[PDB]
């Protein structure tokens, strides 16, 4: 059938949390074959992530790590933890096929990505709208292959891509176990291209959305929810999750 | 029969657009005899927002109208060309049961809420998240029936409520042809008041979300896209839409 789309997603506790959490699995839910394995970044799994997921209405696993006292990239040890629990529930047996993909929590997604991804054999990869001070960043296409990239951010590295724009065969990440994130890196945005590489090379990679011509996802933070008139004392008489 | 579900949507050219219009798209598509009309801030209708809407996959209505100048409100302009068509488009039909409510095109919606709003007779409401300077917004509920508002911001309108917390009945807007918001009011934040004045009474506002505890929709942002690393003179050979 067909084969099984992980989607690794950090999230943590903030005011637009739930929210975003809402829409995002408004769209997850309509993927064929699509497993959701969200990860908190806290001590223990909070009652609001735990009630979402079992009224979300898609499969789902629900983990959690806390980020240690870390204008440095976060979320570097919550995708790790998709990544061990994966290469963990997957038994060196004989089926391991599968795709995964790093989804932020507040990140926007248009369904026709999944089929792009969806035949991922080592690493696929996409442009990915609002990023790196541009309107965009996308791999250069030539012939079916990628011959250099368009960034605003680091153009020099191996791999000049967003952590949104690639996609991993489950196979090359279960046979590259030592392969994970590090966030030593005094580079902020070195994570992406340093964890690349252990993998494959910009040769083998396979431009996906019409040669990199199209952009099927997007970079969307909201703003800091403003709570300067939340009550403290004169309480309202029932108490809302939002 | 089952009645539809007419969303007002204001929408205006800005880098987001196109992300923002796709992810209300994706929870939309799920919600059933649900009409979308989407109004654009413009002189005429975008390219964009045109080819959009035709691979949306969705039924919905693209309409356009011009907003002069205007810290002030907006959308005004555009909600009303949507109360217009509606008025229009059933001047005298006979089973026609429908509701219609106004959907920014940054808001988050739980799939949840349409069920609620769907038996709209008269007027509904329900609560609002992260609006008015505070986690949530909501009317106050007492043995089924409205006797106040939770709100920290003109609590004395007659009904103190956010554009994204009611429903109102197709009925209810056309036994009413000449009930629309009105730009005029020099007084701020009275839009949704003067509407619903003329329209419904309190006593008659029906309580959804279980009788106003639980918050269905929520106010979202998309923070202004950061474009200072984009290219001045060079450029891409492609055009990419974002």
Same mark, same amino acid.
């Given at each position: 059938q067909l084969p099984t789309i992980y989607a690794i997603t950090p999230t943590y506790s903030r005011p637009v949390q739930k929210a975003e959490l809402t829409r995002l699995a408004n769209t997850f839910r309509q993927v064929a074959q699509l497993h959701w394995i969200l990860v908190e970044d806290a001590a223990a799994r909070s009652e609001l992530v735990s009630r979402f997921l079992a009224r979300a209405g898609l499969p789902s696993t629900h983990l959690h790590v806390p980020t240690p006292r870390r204008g440095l990239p976060r979320? /570097?040890?919550? %995708?790790?933890? @998709?990544?061990?629990? =994966? %290469?963990?529930?997957?038994?060196?047996? +004989?089926?391991?096929?599968?795709? =995964?993909?790093?989804? #932020? #929590? #507040?990140? /926007?997604?248009? =369904?026709?990505?999944?089929?792009?991804? +969806?035949?991922? %054999?080592?690493?696929?990869?996409?442009?990915?709208?609002?990023? @790196? @001070? +541009?309107?965009?960043? %996308?791999?250069?296409?030539?012939?079916?292959?990628?011959? @250099?990239?368009? /960034?605003?951010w680091r153009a020099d590295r191996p791999f000049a891509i967003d952590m949104a724009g690639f996609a991993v065969s489950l196979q090359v990440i279960l046979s590259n176990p030592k392969a994970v994130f590090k966030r030593r890196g005094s580079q902020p945005g070195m994570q992406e291209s340093d964890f690349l590489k252990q993998i494959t090379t910009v040769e083998e990679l396979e431009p996906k959305a019409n040669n990199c011509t199209k952009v099927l996802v997007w970079h969307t933070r909201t703003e800091k929810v403003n709570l300067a008139n939340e009550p403290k004392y004169h309480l309202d008489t029932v108490k809302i999750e939002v």
């Amino acid at each position: 059938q067909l084969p099984t789309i992980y989607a690794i997603t950090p999230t943590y506790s903030r005011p637009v949390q739930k929210a975003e959490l809402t829409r995002l699995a408004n769209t997850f839910r309509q993927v064929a074959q699509l497993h959701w394995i969200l990860v908190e970044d806290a001590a223990a799994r909070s009652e609001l992530v735990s009630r979402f997921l079992a009224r979300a209405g898609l499969p789902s696993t629900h983990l959690h790590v806390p980020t240690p006292r870390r204008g440095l990239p976060r979320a /570097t040890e919550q %995708r790790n933890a @998709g990544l061990a629990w =994966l %290469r963990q529930r997957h038994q060196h047996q +004989r089926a391991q096929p599968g795709v =995964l993909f790093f989804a #932020d #929590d #507040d990140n /926007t997604y248009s =369904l026709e990505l999944f089929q792009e991804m +969806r035949t991922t %054999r080592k690493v696929s990869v996409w442009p990915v709208g609002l990023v @790196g @001070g +541009r309107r965009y960043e %996308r791999p250069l296409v030539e012939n079916g292959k990628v011959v @250099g990239w368009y /960034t605003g951010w680091r153009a020099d590295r191996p791999f000049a891509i967003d952590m949104a724009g690639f996609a991993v065969s489950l196979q090359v990440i279960l046979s590259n176990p030592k392969a994970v994130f590090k966030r030593r890196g005094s580079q902020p945005g070195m994570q992406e291209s340093d964890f690349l590489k252990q993998i494959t090379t910009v040769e083998e990679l396979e431009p996906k959305a019409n040669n990199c011509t199209k952009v099927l996802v997007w970079h969307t933070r909201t703003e800091k929810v403003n709570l300067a008139n939340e009550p403290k004392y004169h309480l309202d008489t029932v108490k809302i999750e939002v």
